[PDB]
Amino acid sequence: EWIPETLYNTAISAVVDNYIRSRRDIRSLPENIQFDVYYKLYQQGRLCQLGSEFCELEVFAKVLRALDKRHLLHHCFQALMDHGVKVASVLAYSFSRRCSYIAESDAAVKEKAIQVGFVLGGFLSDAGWYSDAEKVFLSCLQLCTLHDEMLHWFRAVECCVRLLHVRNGNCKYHLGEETFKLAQTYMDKLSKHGQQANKAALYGELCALLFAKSHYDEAYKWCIEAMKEITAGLPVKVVVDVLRQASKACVVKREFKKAEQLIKHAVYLARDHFGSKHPKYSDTLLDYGFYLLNVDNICQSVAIYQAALDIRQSVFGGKNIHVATAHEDLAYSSYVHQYSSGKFDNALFHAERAIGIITHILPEDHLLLASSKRVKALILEEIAIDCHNKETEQRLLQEAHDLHLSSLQLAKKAFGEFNVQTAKHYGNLGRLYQSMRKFKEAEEMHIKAIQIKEQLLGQEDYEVALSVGHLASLYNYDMNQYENAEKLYLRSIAIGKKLFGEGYSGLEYDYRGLIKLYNSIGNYEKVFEYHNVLSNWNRLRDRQYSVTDALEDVSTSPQSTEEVVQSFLIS
């Protein structure tokens, strides 16, 4: 009803229109005043004047102290990175340049640099620019290892916990192990000098590094180690980061009961302190949706990723690596949700964006492309099957064939031959070669995918069961040796009902495989039985599938911070 503009807001537009003359004296304004001047420049679209002062570390130091309006700084920072000027790169270089100049100076001036380094390095870590956050953290780590004092090793351990976080997201896993070993040097030295440093966040970072390298046995071992040292006095951001990456290790360990009590509390705790539109909250949903993706909670797994992406999109601007990873999970979630329907319209668009965002900001040989290009290739595979024109099919399958091996090579270089992810690509290639009519190559790929993934995971695993199903689906159609698939299919249903029950999505293509196997040899005493199994399958999962999201499922949590920790630890 035409409320007059506040004199605070009215005076903001009064100095923005006269920015050029008063440009020098705006930097003398208070921090609460100073931020609103810059946020108005972005709102007016004057990004060039906005970027004319964020390139200085000192100006960006005052702006970083507006903690309430940090969600607006992230949206402005991403706008500059799409505007042109590499404000992330120049700030990191400028901080690293000035950091080395106070090595011989006193610790009073020095301690200010680490405080500046952590807020700036934490912000770039939040903003996703891991390649520039690493150079910030490596500079402040250097200061902490110059003068031997009890406080210096107390923050040197605080650099290595965040150094190991900016190298987990940047796919520098090879250098991640060295940082942990370097962390133990100051951590043990502090422990000897009457200060047992908290090994909770630092042990929590290995819950993602070893998880990324598919060291599930080692990650779950460090999952238990990280969860023990939690404390109610820890920061909530530190606490929620442990729960997310501890829950992920439980999902791949084929344990579902203790995982959901961990990650749901992680969702609840993140939503409480931060809110429903915070980057840390969205980081929990992607880890939370990873649980829903593997427990056959497929209906809300797409929604929880869709909710997760919208949080990052509202805060992280345009071409940001965090949006691409949010795009990545939603692209794959729609891939498995639209499998029967074939509606991979938004699935490819999210996948196309996932390629689009990463290639602009990351190097062409970065490992995150290998994860990103794999899902888009899976989109191209199912699209060519659904398309009617055979000329379209022969081109798109080759395009998907281009992405898998390019993705596989990056996985091979960074993970080694004997790893799940390399064997994960082998399973994809076997299914791909079935569509590519290279059946003999498909047989070679499937046996590679099942003699390596099963070798280290064990005889009982979710992904191993799917890899059997890929080769079981082979012998049914192209090889036509149904005796081989008779034992293979029987393994697929066997592992399917151990954890997922009868009503699992992959088991539908498994029960149908037995009937198709039995239909060739004229067997009918089991076809009639297994037709009743499909009728049981068609109802029982759909009996308990009614629409229900996950944000109200967690709701308020009766479980407290300690009620979740001890329950998971003792069991």
Partner: peptide, 6 residues
């Protein structure tokens, strides 16, 4: 059925 988990 659909594919391996990512």
């Amino acid at each position: 059925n659909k594919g391996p988990a990512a």
